[PDB]
Design an enzyme around this catalytic site. Structure first.
Site, PDB file in Angstrom:
ATOM      1  N   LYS D   9       0.790  -1.213   0.000  1.00 28.65           N
ATOM      2  CA  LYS D   9       0.000   0.000   0.000  1.00 28.65           C
ATOM      3  C   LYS D   9       0.815   1.251   0.000  1.00 28.65           C
ATOM      4  O   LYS D   9       1.959   1.280   0.475  1.00 28.65           O
ATOM      5  CB  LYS D   9      -0.965   0.049   1.194  1.00 28.65           C
ATOM      6  CG  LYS D   9      -0.355   0.087   2.544  1.00 28.65           C
ATOM      7  CD  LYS D   9      -1.339   0.608   3.618  1.00 28.65           C
ATOM      8  CE  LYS D   9      -0.675   0.588   4.993  1.00 28.65           C
ATOM      9  NZ  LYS D   9      -1.413   1.353   6.040  1.00 28.65           N
ATOM     10  N   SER D  25     -10.497   5.469 -16.368  1.00 27.37           N
ATOM     11  CA  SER D  25     -11.054   4.869 -15.147  1.00 27.37           C
ATOM     12  C   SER D  25      -9.947   4.435 -14.164  1.00 27.37           C
ATOM     13  O   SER D  25     -10.230   4.073 -13.019  1.00 27.37           O
ATOM     14  CB  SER D  25     -11.965   3.652 -15.502  1.00 27.37           C
ATOM     15  OG  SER D  25     -11.435   2.772 -16.647  1.00 27.37           O
ATOM     16  N   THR D  58     -10.394   0.107  -8.624  1.00 26.17           N
ATOM     17  CA  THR D  58     -10.099   0.251 -10.040  1.00 26.17           C
ATOM     18  C   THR D  58      -8.810  -0.523 -10.335  1.00 26.17           C
ATOM     19  O   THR D  58      -8.561  -1.556  -9.703  1.00 26.17           O
ATOM     20  CB  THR D  58     -10.066   1.750 -10.425  1.00 26.17           C
ATOM     21  OG1 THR D  58      -9.736   1.905 -11.811  1.00 26.17           O
ATOM     22  CG2 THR D  58      -9.002   2.535  -9.629  1.00 26.17           C
ATOM     23  N   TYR D  59      -8.000  -0.067 -11.274  1.00 29.71           N
ATOM     24  CA  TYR D  59      -6.678  -0.656 -11.479  1.00 29.71           C
ATOM     25  C   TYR D  59      -5.637   0.446 -11.592  1.00 29.71           C
ATOM     26  O   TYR D  59      -5.983   1.612 -11.877  1.00 29.71           O
ATOM     27  CB  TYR D  59      -6.681  -1.548 -12.734  1.00 29.71           C
ATOM     28  CG  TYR D  59      -6.985  -0.822 -14.010  1.00 29.71           C
ATOM     29  CD1 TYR D  59      -8.285  -0.515 -14.357  1.00 29.71           C
ATOM     30  CD2 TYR D  59      -5.972  -0.424 -14.881  1.00 29.71           C
ATOM     31  CE1 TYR D  59      -8.579   0.180 -15.525  1.00 29.71           C
ATOM     32  CE2 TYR D  59      -6.263   0.257 -16.070  1.00 29.71           C
ATOM     33  CZ  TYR D  59      -7.560   0.552 -16.379  1.00 29.71           C
ATOM     34  OH  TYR D  59      -7.881   1.247 -17.539  1.00 29.71           O
ATOM     35  N   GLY D  74     -10.469  11.011 -14.876  1.00 26.22           N
ATOM     36  CA  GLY D  74     -11.356   9.936 -15.328  1.00 26.22           C
ATOM     37  C   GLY D  74     -12.575   9.651 -14.435  1.00 26.22           C
ATOM     38  O   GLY D  74     -13.019  10.520 -13.691  1.00 26.22           O
ATOM     39  N   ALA D  75     -13.094   8.420 -14.508  1.00 19.89           N
ATOM     40  CA  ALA D  75     -14.379   8.020 -13.893  1.00 19.89           C
ATOM     41  C   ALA D  75     -14.331   7.992 -12.365  1.00 19.89           C
ATOM     42  O   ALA D  75     -15.357   8.192 -11.692  1.00 19.89           O
ATOM     43  CB  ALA D  75     -14.773   6.629 -14.380  1.00 19.89           C
ATOM     44  N   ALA D  76     -13.140   7.710 -11.842  1.00 18.55           N
ATOM     45  CA  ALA D  76     -12.923   7.571 -10.405  1.00 18.55           C
ATOM     46  C   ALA D  76     -12.949   8.938  -9.723  1.00 18.55           C
ATOM     47  O   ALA D  76     -12.931   9.016  -8.498  1.00 18.55           O
ATOM     48  CB  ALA D  76     -11.595   6.868 -10.138  1.00 18.55           C
TER      49      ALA D  76
END
Lengths: 117, 116, 117, 116
Positions: D9, D25, D58-59, D74-76
């Site tokens: 992390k 995304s 997400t990735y 993006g989408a996030a």
């Protein structure tokens, strides 16, 4: 022995074409051609990120007729997407670390009338 | 590569019990239903609420066979009420080659949780 | 070859004892004795179902001092639980179908002052 | 039995870019940060927002090394704003016996995404 979860492939910014206003049916039905390009299998778990409304949900893929250009969100999932919404549909696979380190996802890009590439 | 595939589902069962003062977290399901969908005691499941659109995850336990029960008596009661229609699914992993021909176990319902 | 996701074990209705009101730190810290009874490992993914407020979230376990009876929800996760809230903490493992069919989860039940059993 | 364990992390990085009209995304992350946390290009990640409590998945993709970027361009972007503090994690599976001694790769940050 240590196993990674990797993006297998995705349909990037496809448009939802049908969403059961009755919440009948199940899954997300996807033109077989699009499944082929993204490497996604019938009955495979998929994550859907709705770029239009921000909703994120998970379900499974089923095939729609080849050449139909259908993206149909049925069942409970029609609470999360509507006709016209832009979505990213992804599948994830697992594999060992060494394979993950050179893995290339299958990506299909869309525009217009769900025209691929 | 290992794929995550739909193992099975109960397609449009109704929630039958949902009192949030039963203390648990599992979804108790008529064993006949578990048998049809291939879902196991203590297996992770996803529950998708067709009525209210809520989506959540827990695990399955058996309710009496013949009882037709779908019980979110417990913590999952924040996500469904009795009379709500839900889809209950489990997922399994297997190699890509096997996944290409995999067939999920699907049980369909009408009326008062009557299996077709 | 077909692999199931099964409940490995859980802490059933333990009480949250600390929740960083500052959202500092990370993870859920859990008395090692409780981890032992539930079969949960340090750094293992866990799902937390908050019975008091209905929130469901996922994070990872870390060990608190044996005998401390601590359930500490830190970081972002303190947005999802508060001191006094009753939670169920679960881990899931994968195994082949035949093993899954006779699998018995490790369950620790709690009452009072996070008294186990 | 196979366990799911924290691989690594990024502990308290700030989101640096979050314009929801970038179309993607993924979360783009300084390669130096990916290297420290053992997170791979195209790996699934979880993002936990310390500021607003939102949690999403997400990735990862690489941003330039040295850039110190954490981008949900993006989408996030519905889930984090620039200046938000987040934790970014990935998870791996391995047999129980290996899991008992597994050590995650953790990178700690101060100030303007400076690695300690």
């Amino acid at each position: 022995s240590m196993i990674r979860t990797m993006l297998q492939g995705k349909l990037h910014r496809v448009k939802v074409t049908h969403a059961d206003l009755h919440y009948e049916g199940s899954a997300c039905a996807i033109d077989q051609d699009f499944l082929d390009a993204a490497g996604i299998l019938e009955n495979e778990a998929i994550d859907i990120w709705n770029v239009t409304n921000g909703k994120r949900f998970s379900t499974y893929a089923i095939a729609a007729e080849r050449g139909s250009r259908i993206i149909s969100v049925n069942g409970a999932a029609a609470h999360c997407a509507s006709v016209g919404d832009i979505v990213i549909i992804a599948s994830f696979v697992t594999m060992p670390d060494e394979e993950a380190r050179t893995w290339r996802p299958n990506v299909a890009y869309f525009e217009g009338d769900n025209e691929m590439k």
